[PDB]
């Protein structure tokens, strides 16, 4: 397969900005590159083909350029409807292959997360399997790191993160980190803490509880 | 101009055949090349194959060749499926051009896509959710509470608060597939700390495919 590599994976921008996203291929593809726009849960839409030809109906603020192994999509004066994920795709040869996308998201002021920790309810404890939930609410930008500590020791594994889409009203994100343990394991430690690092925090924030207190 | 709409069973068990179809209108089916593209959760777009309308001539992705069948509406059959075949499946028209000056052709780019039909490959059986309270507050002015909705299958569940009268500050996370093969998510809401102790917060959890409805009071521990 011809490898198609898009950069950056995400860019933050504002309406009125000019934005540039890059697409590079592992071998030459002449000018056989297409660009697509995807909004959540919606069908993809062709924007550009043959590297620089605008598809029917696409507004002129979109322009494609490049040839060979290096290509560019430029959006001149970004508009509200342009926040989306963009994919490039080569078709000089079989199989056609796609880049993994660039998400163009809405810039706003930095906002630290408000952090909350939730111990497992007594009836989850009775089930024999417990979930400990750490919540990061209404923060920006997206990048955030959560570490779990048990009795002051780093706990890796057994955790899953989930994040919301950018809020339509305040453009923030929220995130859960859920630590899932057998009750036997859970009962073998006393204090449970989730430690959050984020640009809006000058130092990491920790929220903790003592099991059974 | 052209309109594409794919359909098929939303669930397939492992080792079985995944079958999807695509209804196309608005143009002469014969003169165009039609095909399938998918995207598995967390993965990129992957071309499966494209076929000539008139003659049923076409090619497949070499990685999927061995278990793929595309026929002319057009149909897709993918045999011996596994969890990795869980994806959204899009119908599409594939365009190509002479690379000549020569007999060489380009491969395909895609000028029209359907909305895409989601298909999940899993051995799990339909199962209703458990619902556990997320409880902490009077030190801070704002408190968070929620409901953990887990061990259900298939998607989706819906969550509301106080029968839908509470909407501001609600966040309902996307579901995650656990190793067990069952899904889990949380719904959370932030409220004034001063309201805890006079107001009741109830999460209403619905899971249609099991016909399950749950109301769960979220109290201070």
Cβ partners under 8 Å of residue B72, min gap 6: B29, B34, B51, B53, B56
Same domain assignment for residues B186 and B97: no
Same domain assignment for residues B147 and B70: no
Same domain assignment for residues B129 and B101: no
Rounded to whole angstroms, the Cα distance separating B121 from B8 reads 13
CATH number of domain containing B110: 2.60.40.10
Cis amide leading into A95 (omega within 30) = yes
Task: Compare all CA atoms of chain A with the CA of B172 and give the residue at the minimum distance.
Answer: A164
CB-based contact, A27 to chain B, within 8 Å: no
Domain that holds residue B169: 124-219
Count of A-B CB contacts under 8 Å:
124
Same domain assignment for residues B82 and B7: yes
Q: In the beta sheet, which residues pair with residue A89?
A: A34, A98
Q: Last residue of a domain, which of B123, B143, B177?
A: B123
Interface of B with A in 184-213 (CB under 8 A): 184-186, 188, 190
Q: Last residue of a domain, which of B92, B123, B154?
A: B123
Name the nearest CA neighbour of A34 among B88, B95, B44.
B95
Domains of chain A and any CATH numbers: 1-107 (2.60.40.10), 108-213 (2.60.40.10)
- Sheet of strand A114-118, all strands in order from the earlier edge strand to the far edge: A114-118, A129-139, A173-182, A159-163
CB contact (8 A) between residue A137 and residue B115: no
A92 three-class SS? coil
The token pair that represents A169 in the structure block: 């009203």
Q: Last residue of a domain, which of B74, B100, B123?
A: B123
Structural domains in chain B (count): 2
Same domain assignment for residues B8 and B109: yes
Strands (E), B100-201: 109-113, 117-121, 130-134, 142-152, 158-161, 170-172, 176-177, 183-192
Cis amide leading into A141 (omega within 30) = yes
Look at strands A45-49 and A145-150 and give their pairing.
unpaired
CB-based contact, B144 to chain A, within 8 Å: yes
Look at strands A205-210 and A191-197 and give their pairing.
antiparallel
- Sheet of strand B3-7, all strands in order from the earlier edge strand to the far edge: B3-7, B18-25, B74-78, B68-71
CA angle A26, A32, A34 (to 5 degrees): 95
Strands (E), A9-109: 10-13, 19-25, 33-38, 45-49, 53-54, 62-67, 70-75, 84-90, 97-98, 102-106
Same domain assignment for residues B104 and B165: no
Same domain assignment for residues B75 and B178: no
Same domain assignment for residues B45 and B130: no
Same domain assignment for residues B112 and B135: no
Same domain assignment for residues B93 and B185: no
Same domain assignment for residues B115 and B22: yes
* Biggest distance spanned by C-alpha atoms of chain B: 80
- Per CB-CB distance under 8 Å, the chain B contacts of A98 are 44-47
Name the nearest CA neighbour of B36 among B81, B95, B76.
B76
Query: What was the resolution (in A) of this experimentally determined structure?
Result: 1.6
DSSP tag of B174: P
The token pair that represents B73 in the structure block: 């509406």
CB-based contact, A114 to chain B, within 8 Å: yes
Same domain assignment for residues B171 and B111: no
B90 three-class SS? strand
């Amino acid at each position: 397969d011809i490898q198609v590599t898009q950069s950056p994976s995400s860019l933050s921008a504002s309406v009125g900005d000019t934005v540039t996203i890059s697409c590079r291929t592992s071998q030459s593809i002449s000018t056989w590159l297409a660009w697509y726009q995807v909004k959540p849960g919606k069908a993809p839409k062709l924007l550009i083909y043959t590297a620089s030809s605008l598809a029917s109906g696409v507004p002129s603020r979109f322009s494609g350029s490049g040839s060979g192994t290096d290509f560019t999509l430029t959006i001149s004066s970004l508009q509200s409807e342009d926040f989306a994920t963009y994919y490039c795709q080569q078709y000089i040869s079989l199989p056609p292959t796609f880049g993994l996308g660039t998400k163009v998201e809405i810039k706003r002021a930095v906002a630290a997360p408000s952090v909350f920790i939730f111990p497992p309810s007594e009836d989850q404890v009775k089930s024999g399997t417990v979930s400990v939930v750490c919540l990061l609410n209404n923060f920006y930008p997206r990048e955030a790191s959560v570490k779990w500590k048990v009795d002051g020791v780093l706990k890796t594994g057994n955790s899953q993160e989930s994040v919301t889409e950018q809020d339509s009203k305040d453009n923030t994100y929220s995130l859960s980190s859920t630590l899932t343990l057998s009750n036997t394991d859970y009962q073998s430690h006393n204090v449970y803490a989730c430690e959050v690092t984020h640009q809006g925090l000058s130092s990491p924030v920790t929220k903790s509880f003592n099991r059974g207190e | 101009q052209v309109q594409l709409q794919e359909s098929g069973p939303g669930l397939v068990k492992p080792s079985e055949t995944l079958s999807v179809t695509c209804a196309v209108s608005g143009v002469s089916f014969s003169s165009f090349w039609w095909g399938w593209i998918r995207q598995s959760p967390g993965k990129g777009l992957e071309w499966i194959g494209t076929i000539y309308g008139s003659s049923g001539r076409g090619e497949y992705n070499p990685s999927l060749k061995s278990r793929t069948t595309i026929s002319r509406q057009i149909s897709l059959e993918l045999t011996s499926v596994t969890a990795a075949d869980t994806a959204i499946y899009y119908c599409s028209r594939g365009l190509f051009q002479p690379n000549g000056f020569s007999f060489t052709l380009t491969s395909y780019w895609f000028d029209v896509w359907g909305p895409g039909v989601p298909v999940t490959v899993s051995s799990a059986s339909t199962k209703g959710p458990s619902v556990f309270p997320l409880a902490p507050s009077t030190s801070e002015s704002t408190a968070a509470l929620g409901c953990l909705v887990k061990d259900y299958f298939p998607e989706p569940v819906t969550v509301s608060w106080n029968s839908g009268s509470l909407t501001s500050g609600v966040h309902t996370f996307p579901a995650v597939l656990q190793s067990s093969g069952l899904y889990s998510l949380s719904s959370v809401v932030t409220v004034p700390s001063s309201s805890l102790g006079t107001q009741t917060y109830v999460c209403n959890v619905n899971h249609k495919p099991s016909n399950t409805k749950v109301d769960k009071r979220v109290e201070i521990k």
